[model samples]
Target: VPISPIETVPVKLKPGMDGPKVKQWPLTEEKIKALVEICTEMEKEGKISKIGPENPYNTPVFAIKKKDSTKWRKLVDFRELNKRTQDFWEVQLGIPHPAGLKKKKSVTVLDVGDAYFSVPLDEDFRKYTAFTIPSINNETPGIRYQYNVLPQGWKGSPAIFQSSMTKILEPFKKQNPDIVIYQYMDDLYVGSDLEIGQHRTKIEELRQHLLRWGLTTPDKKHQKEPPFLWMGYELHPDKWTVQPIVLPEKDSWTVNDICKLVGKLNWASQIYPGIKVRQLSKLLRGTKALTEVIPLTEEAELELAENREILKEPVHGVYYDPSKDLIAEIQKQGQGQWTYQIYQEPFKNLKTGKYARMRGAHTNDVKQLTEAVQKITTESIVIWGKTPKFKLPIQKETWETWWTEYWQATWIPEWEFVNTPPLVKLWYQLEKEPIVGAETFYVDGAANRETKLGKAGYVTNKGRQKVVPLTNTTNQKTELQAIYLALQDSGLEVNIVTNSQYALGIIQAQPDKSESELVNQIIEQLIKKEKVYLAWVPAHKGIGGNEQVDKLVSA
Candidate 1:
């Protein structure tokens, strides 16, 4: 196995490091053999080199038999030494999320068999990786070993290994911009939506790079495409799913067992929302002893069991389409607890062809709630304030931010915040039917990059048009103005066309970070139009409406 030198600038640990407190787990004959065999092979591969037991500073090593493959995986605890390591966790690999891969038709995921050994640890800092392998008898001391390459379980292992792998794959990424490559520590994923044939080529290319760097690749079990596991989630062309995992069946569980169980839930929490097993995990972390018995309260037990049940069934994920309408069902519980479920309007299921409403996670995030409203169509009504009593008991000051930011402060009561519930509940009640009777108007927004001068115009199908120059602004802002012009040509079902996807996408999802009044104006007008269509047509296509709109902007 060859090691990579790319991005392999070994870490320089600070001085004043002390010795590690070595502790050994009970090692059976099986554990000893697994350790010796792997250690010996790694030595021959130049991964770890034997050094005299001279280094005062070191960490401990252990192994455990895995459930899936009864193989004993090695572990090293750098708790003490790693504390001496500095720098931000920002160096950690920013893995591509599964949510982003939903649109990909083909994906290839890989595991670097010797991920830790793919980069060399600085010789000056490498001696700190020393550990003693306990003899089978447990009475005699074992020889000292230190990693020649990157050391696993060390603080820098994941960050350093991933950065090196990313560098190795960076050239391929630049060469093939269409292929999306993700290096999550050593687990590499290659995904492509527009080109499926490039999938195998990219995977083969990834392996060839590993070969040049002297890094070993797993031969037997590299499931490089969908149907394989990516970070414990099963990948499929449609969506990634997960199956119910088995938890400890025994009644009495140690703190270690409880914490480990929470670890599983922590992973599952990403797949299944509203799993309230977090309290148990925090409880386990605070306890001192690993072998100590963990007592669970009835509430904690119920929460754990519910989360277990949530993970027990196969979970199918939903993909969101901005083109489709979404509904926000907000249920306001007094005491400032408000929850909303964003549900996609029933769409034909891809596999079953049956209507399925793809409901998503519900948490009180007025910002996201505001975002949800942008997805709602004119047909989709916003249902607010159907609580037990019509005079909503929730205080206005409690949700003032929601009312101010999302409600656009349409109205604030003259009465006390509580007595004036109408301003909060009645605002959404006034419904506007979709504006209709219209023609498609192509819009062109022209800007001088050097001068920062901006101008925009729109030409309707009926040749009804307007063009105007504006002060300093961006290309997107100008297009926004053109759309504003069409919407003002009021009472006609206005179909707006633009060539910039950025302007359209920005308009669709209202910006919070950067305030755009034109966006608000367009969205307000867009709310009333029943079947308003937004299409992007490139300029210079010789299309009649597009050309006339350009001519109006230029003339």
Candidate 2:
């Protein structure tokens, strides 16, 4: 095929940049012959040409052994070379979902076999696509060749070619407004709702139009009725499905592997919109550098496993029906991040006796979390199964926030506490008369993240006060410190009141099992003392001494 009107623009090599300095990958003499044969065939087709050995550019060349075969598949490692050239960002349209072809009975996919090679690159720019392979003749180091057309391995090739095809199809698109054309780079699908005869004419008309622009439909199979595949998705009369992607197994993976895998999964996600990749967000962010080898932590493995489980199913797709029960599911995925999927709940189809799919809108959001959840609750029926799945998918803060809101919310929604632990139900003596031989004090701690300072303070019911500042401390540490400092006061039957359950739980219940040296010392002061008691009290609506010490720490 002759080159289309599309031409690859000049590569803008950054200042002080040079061509790839890498050498050919090591391969057997027989394998080198396979690589040479492939290049020579492309050369004969006018797609590539042997260039003078003195050309200033040479990108490293590598080949993958064809699976289940002896022949080699060639690839030029233009990764570094792609980076050295300046960029022009262009949107590669996503593959259209088969659901969008609902009205159509026939779809014809035209494969542009040459793909990127159908567009020519100018003489000055073609040298940048130069690459070398080991010479079959023993005397020469390597044989160099440059692509005569837009190279498949070049970064800008797709954007340039895809843009060209869009332009080439523009006139056809305007003329044939009734036919739906789905063109993503080289794969073009033309769908028509008309009968087979009409669809055939449309396909021929499309083929002739493409030929005018120097594009070819190399494969003979053109028209397909229902139950044919388009792109990767299988389109049946009723449903759309696809084969799950099989990723190669690796004992360990580099950041680049994860990065590429994430890209592939993300592209699939655009088709199967409900397939959540939010789980892989952190794993993919393991390194800012793509090539860094990363250890898979337990959390990373679990998160990746979540995505793998979703991939086990062939595909998850949207089913649009305006009159359906909408549902909302808000999941607190780790690291202060959240994912929520707003979907229509599945309903049985009366005629087919099968359930229709839910429409999908799963999203990863931090700032968008609260408002979406709040709005969904007011509008849709949120699927809250009896007892939220805490261990399976949720963590501490999710339960805390949801539980607190569930509790204080009007008996229109107050939790009816059953078999509750004392931790949540503990009662405090707010107005007991002071005992003759004992002193009760409220202790609390405060920390300023901005100032990086902490204060520990205690206020006795008798108006006695003590406060201390510590250089490096957190609110929890200072809470422990406050009680420790309070215990130093002259001996008495001592009773401490504080709202920090974290403080009371460690000191009173698990003192013997404490790990920290400070905790051990605090345990000693407790056991080695005059009579002592640590108690949990609720914060805020005025326990007099608790309020006093809260103010004392701030002061």
Candidate 3:
């Protein structure tokens, strides 16, 4: 039966790569003859026609035996053309979900024949689908044929067909507004509980509409009853009571076979979220090998058994409010001396009163603080225990002597202070001290850009000289190290002095990197019971502590 004609969007080739040239694969007489007959029939039906031999695009053609049939099917390799084809937007088909069939006691399924071939190829773009087959006489240049209609392998055929089908079904849609209709590619299914006469009339009207568009419904494919297969789902009459079509169990299967089955099971999960699909996913991913030699493990066997056990029970479906915020819990754990461990749990199915539990470790280290911010659910948060200690700068100098004599040759250009120096001084003096009391420390870093060398150091009022190890150093890295060292040395409130603007700005700004762990620790602790303060001081401007710290970093 003819399908309503649809104009396919043209395939756009990529720049610089011209389409393929004429090519042919050797074939037996029977195959060649079968291809010729098919082409002849296609030509008569206006599906394809002869194209000039000079065409730039030419794909190779082949034939394959039809399953359980003597007839051979003509096929073409459209890979080269498909690669350059731009994708088209497809009509989203909201099929009658099995859960949605609770009220409808009956269903009718219809299949559209030769769905892809129904859409007419744009005349200008038809030559791009040219393919040559081996001639009967082994002619010097084989006959080249191109499709006038959308062919099976063309990239945009499905979208074009869908668009056309949607237009054609509009009238039928309005006429039978009560009947639930769905289409996936060429397959159509209608579900309704109308009286038999009204249902039959609906089916007959759709059938007539299809005929008008040169389409026909196969008597064998037509099903007017429930429990009939439509798409991959087995539709019944209740919410959460649908089953996906799965392969029958066998005694044993090769790893390759198992992987293939798992792939199918994955697709089935979208329609039916049964226990087996999720377990199978983990099993397949856990077992990397997909070859025939790979043996199935005990874990997989157990998972399969669990899947079967879960499938025996009806699925639990519940309506959840979209407006409600998800819940999250943060728990602090002792990881000994300087390090604190934290775990975060986010609840996924709050309405169902079930913990679709998703949990992860939230590192208290400054470097991972940004990660915690990104992943933690902001609303309805629950915190446990006290946030511990941890977590949580710039300047000038010079002239001719600064550049040529006393100053290091590799020093980075001095960054001008954006805020008023008087305000910086004012803020430094007025900044609140930690309520729990803390030690004062001066920190600074020196880096030689030309040599890729750097050092970080902090000097405490207690006369301790501390230096952080230098590895893969950058000015920023060294500056961060100095701050980290200051935080590590004392658990109490600490006032830090730095000659680096980067270190100072980082403390006041949002957490942005590997050093953010330190920031997170200080903030968390501040929220709990501890207190910390950070301040910036201008560098090398005759400040004794700043100079001493700079000398320590240079050392």
Candidate 4:
């Protein structure tokens, strides 16, 4: 039997978009030699081929250090390659549900060596995986190397190899109807109800099939082991729950580290109880950068402890019982056209005294928090008999008037149609005492490059105005300062308009601890005021108030 190279579909890049030329990481002499050896050996084996710098694409090369050792192996940064290529849909291989695996006594685990490289790259797509060694003294300098087979970080490699493996294993599945075979990427698990000897035979049989197909079995098999590692998850047949082998630990981790750890935990959260509910995970998601170290709070430490405890517990089953009843509860609040706190209680448990507290003022915004609750019934092992609940407040008609006044005060449609007589009449009507707030203010921010100065201006209904010079000279900070000044000068019922989405988003989302002091001040002011509406005007849209403020800031 002749083994053939696997072919992949060609990738499409956007027109006029240049492929990235990422800078190579600094490598030690030993690491460089290790990479050269791997490339040279693989080149001889026809797995990789050398090219010149004349090719259009070039990505960086770096050594992936072995765990607890100075030894290293080469890997490319294929991020830019992935960005330009079409996404490959991950194929489902009919892996058993966690519940289905609970009954099996013995499990066999198998893995492939050089998993990605086993499948050959499609000829035309090979050039796109190019990496250059510009300074290797022993090897050809300024020479580019490309993988003939699918590269580890290539966009389509995982899907192509997994799909190929699945096809190769199809015949084995037909021959053994009693054995349950599951493939997650390249790792294969053969689970059975049979005795230890029968399971070992099945494992050996599966290995023979892969060997015939030219897929090398390099990893040790986990036979008779109750828990086995699969795709970063520790799958335990004894406990009936899948858990992450690596958990998020320490406060000094980079924000990217926190994000990756949280993402992994969130994936397992569907099966593992108490993981999704941690506020610390939510905090990690809201963080801004990958380079910054995460701040450890007392709350985060407690949540981390809870996560550790939850990961150890054994869940009973994966499927939910549909026979159990569930309920959703809703509540509404309204006052003088001022509305607040429409809370939703999803997955309400009267027995356990567990119910969702509405965190934000808007009931509509709380959907994200409640959205996870709906999945709880389907995925939870213990919550079957418990009743689920959700809540929504009935909105008042007067709120519409407030919004209309807000839009009019900002002069959105009015600015778009200021010359038209009918719109002018409607605008006047919208500004009437009963509909509009007692006072209206339009604010704008300016950051001047030449003078290195920041300024904020606000205009009132009485033709009164003020422009204040600011110490902080950022556009966002200036905009926030303008808003703060407007709120301080306003009456019981007031409307403030600005053109900063950053300020508006923070104000709307409910300020968190990470928000700036200016935002916190706005949050405090809003809590005290009876009716204060902050509205957004599209910047440079020729609105009269916005135009005036633009001129004022410039002056």
Q: Pick the candidate with the highest lDDT.
A: 2
lDDT of 2 at 186: 83
Clashing pairs in 2: 410-413
lDDT of 2 by residue, 98-151 (tens): 433434667777687667666777667776778887876767877788888776
Best by TM-score: 3
- Ranked by TM-score from best down, the candidates are 3, 2, 1, 4
Tell me how candidate 4 scores on lDDT.
Answer: 0.59
Q: What TM-score fits each model?
A: 0.54, 0.58, 0.60, 0.52
* Range of the 10 consecutive residues with the lowest summed lDDT in candidate 4: 334-343
The ten-residue window of minimal lDDT in model 1 covers: 349-358
Better of 1 and 2 by TM-score: 2
After TM-score superposition, the amount by which residue 158's alpha carbon in candidate 4 deviates from its true location, in angstroms, is 1.3
Once fitted onto the true fold, the runs of candidate 3 whose alpha carbons sit more than 4 angstroms away are 1-20, 27-37, 40-46, 50-57, 63-73, 79-105, 123-128, 135-144, 240-433, 450-453, 462-464, 469-472, 497-529, 536-547
TM-score (C-alpha) between model 1 and the true structure = 0.54
lDDT of 4 at 27: 66
Q: Distance (Å) between predicted and true CA of 344, model 2?
A: 5.2
lDDT scores of the candidates, listed in order: 0.60, 0.61, 0.56, 0.59
| Candidate 3 displacement at residue 116 in angstroms | 2.0
For 460-524, candidate 3 gives per-residue lDDT tens digits of 77777787657567787788778777767765566677777766654453232222464555344
